[PDB]
C-alpha cells in the first residue's frame, strides 16, 4: 500500500516544482534575480520484501 505515498509524494514534489517555475515567471526581469531551482531524489530503499 506504499503506492499511496508514492503518488502523493510525486504530487507534492510536482507542486513544489511548479511553484519554483512560477517564481521564475514572476521574476523574469527583476534586477539581479537568479534562476531559482528545485531538486529531486529517490526515497530510501527498504528491504521490506523481495
Amino acid at each position: 500500500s506504499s503506492l499511496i505515498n508514492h503518488a502523493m509524494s510525486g504530487l507534492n514534489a510536482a507542486q513544489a516544482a511548479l511553484n519554483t517555475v512560477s517564481n521564475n515567471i514572476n521574476n523574469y526581469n527583476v534586477a539581479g534575480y537568479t534562476r531559482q531551482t528545485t531538486i529531486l531524489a529517490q526515497a530510501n530503499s527498504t528491504l521490506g520484501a523481495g
Partner: peptide
Amino acid sequence: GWIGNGVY
C-alpha cells in the same frame, strides 16, 4: 526548503 513568494 528555500522558497520565494514571487515579485512585488
